[PDB]
Design a protein around this ligand. Sequence first.
Ligand SMILES: [Zn+2]
Ligand SMILES: [Zn+2]
Ligand SMILES: [Zn+2]
Lengths: 56, 92, 65, 49, 183, 56, 30, 147, 119
Amino acid sequence: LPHFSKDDYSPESKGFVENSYLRGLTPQEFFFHAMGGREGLIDTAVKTAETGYIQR
Amino acid sequence: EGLVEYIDAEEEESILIAMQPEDLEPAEADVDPAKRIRVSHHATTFTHCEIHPSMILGVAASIIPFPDHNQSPRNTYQSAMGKQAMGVFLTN
Amino acid sequence: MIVPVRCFSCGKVVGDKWESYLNLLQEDELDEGTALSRLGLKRYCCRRMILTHVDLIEKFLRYNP
Amino acid sequence: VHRNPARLMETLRTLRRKGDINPEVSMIRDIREKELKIFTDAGRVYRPL
Amino acid sequence: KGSRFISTLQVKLYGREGSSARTIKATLPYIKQDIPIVIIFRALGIIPDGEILEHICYDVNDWQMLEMLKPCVEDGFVIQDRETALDFIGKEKRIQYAKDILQKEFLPHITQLEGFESRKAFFLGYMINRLLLCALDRKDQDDRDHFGKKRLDLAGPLLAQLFKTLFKKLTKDIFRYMQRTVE
Amino acid sequence: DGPTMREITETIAEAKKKVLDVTKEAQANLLTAKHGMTLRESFEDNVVRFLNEARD
Amino acid sequence: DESAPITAEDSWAVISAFFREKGLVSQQLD
Amino acid sequence: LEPGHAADQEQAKLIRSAIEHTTLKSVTIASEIYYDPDPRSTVIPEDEEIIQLHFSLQQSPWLLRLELDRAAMNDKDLTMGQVGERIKQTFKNDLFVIWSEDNDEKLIIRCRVVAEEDHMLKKIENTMLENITLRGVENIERVVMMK
Amino acid sequence: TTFRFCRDCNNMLYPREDKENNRLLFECRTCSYVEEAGSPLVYRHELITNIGETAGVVQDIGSDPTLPRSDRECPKCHSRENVFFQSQQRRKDTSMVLFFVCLSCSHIFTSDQKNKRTQ
RNA sequence: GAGG
DNA sequence: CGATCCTC
Ligand SMILES: [Zn+2]
Ligand SMILES: [Zn+2]
Ligand SMILES: [Zn+2]
């Protein structure tokens, strides 16, 4: 993200959500969770299409 | 008056952004445990600041109460549903 | 779209309270919480009834016919 | 090309921040790649800061 | 602001990772086969090897990139002038087609005019520099998912496409009506 | 619990220290990857592990 | 003081300023 | 592993080294082509010690000099002699190979061909790096020892 | 390596052996030019490369706001004003090593404890 | 086009 | 030459 400095491999920098859904997620944490989340919705859509064909 | 300015992903590459005006740049020298974990300024070489982080969202997501306390797919699903909801669409 | 007559949850009549409520906020210059209590809306099912009512009839009446 | 791009870039931004260069115009200075890139073109999604 | 003319130029580094004699060849619109890079530079006006390489390599101290271009220097060794370079591409008439193809088809963004080539050759050089910069494992292959490199076509732009098309047909109809007016 | 939260917090801080040390070691060129994998790949595998461990 | 720095609450005035001029569908209109 | 004698960590390290496909490329830092005309008197002052030997128990004035990576040589169960005797058993007579000892500070291999010369040695270096199986089975790119 | 072009032509110079005197020379193929070589080195490959790690060190470097600043002391002057980055050699098998550019004397220093370096 |  | 089910 443009809130980080160049070459940052720190937990926080690369998608480590330190917070619980109770405590609440920070904007950075929020975005990274969304990025992970998306990938999951995409292959959910992929699995259902692919497995259905396999079954046939 | 040059207090605010327009940035696109290309120019975004060359700038360093603070998330909060205060909470991202006052100074340094006890805490609320209930409050979430917010890292450190650490980088100070800032050129800009975020008007408000919640603005990363759009119309549908803007309706959710505390999505920062929800699983990410649930915010996507809720976004789909608010478009199936009922209410006054217009006064006319 | 006008003060619902009666609280959905409990039944306490709320149709007679809207105008009195606005006056308490306007004239009397009270806050919503003291105003709701002044109208005798003790339960939260009754408080939400008035507090969250959006009066679109005023907008609808603004139309020329 | 340009020799003293630091001076050029400071003038360019000043003008856009004053108004003399359209606020939607993007000016990107890549210090390490010795590069100045400008876009006046339509289609670019931007956000205020 | 002048039509929607798209032509994609490719700068292709031949020879696999670990294959000796790695050559660089370019694709030109309406040209049957690939053309070695030095032949493009020669056909543009840049003749000496050192001057061609001066356009690609931006630092003298970079022998790595210079050894990367040694086979290109050999590839077009047989051509040492603009006349025979333009001739390569494609009577006599074949040279004009090539000259015209360099100004009209090759890099239409920059210019589609005549009196340039210097701007075109330098840019072609920038392109190769970038191709080598990656090939030399100094740079990361361009990300085709970077949002900044993507544009969004809205109401105006879409209407403009249609309007250009429609107005041209109208313009054409007026001319057919003019042509029919023989009396 | 107030005590429990305080302890989760310290668990995460120790993962942050392990991740910092492996990084500091990595940057000193003292980190030596085992056969079959990049010095970077091994570092990455390690960091992800400490972080996953911390969550559990 | 007029020179004093902004708080995160002060952000909402700028946001209000944004939409009071742009509204919500400026991309379309613009 | 062999029933034995299968739970021995050492024998495993060997079988891994016997099967993982290893090329000259995987062990080379750089390959240089110097103009060294005097075979006995070297222009490279580092190499002087190597030249003293390889005389007891006509060529080309062009030298091909490969510098090997100590780390890589130790990841694989490889020694200078092994690499050297393997380069020798490829060209047999059409190449002369000399080399640095395993103890020696820098790991060096020197090669000479046995009109139109400068092109040939560049062609040979390509065949050395990309086409010489030092040890291992072809297609077996990586091998991992797992308990 | 470091290779030259013809003084007059500005065309690539090619190797040539004396054979009689056994010495390295460089001939032009566009004209009749000939000059002696400096170093005997003709070709250098390099599969394990050190060049491009420090690529991008420009005097204006300290003005890049995205680059991080370390608390480190410059070995040359004792300036603690410096910017830093990891190897710009964008390859898979690369060191996690840092490079520091002292923002007071332009000195490039490294986090590396194993290798030395001459940049 | 929208629903799981 | 293929690419989940339903009806609008
Ligand atoms: Zn009630
Ligand atoms: Zn010459
Ligand atoms: Zn210094």
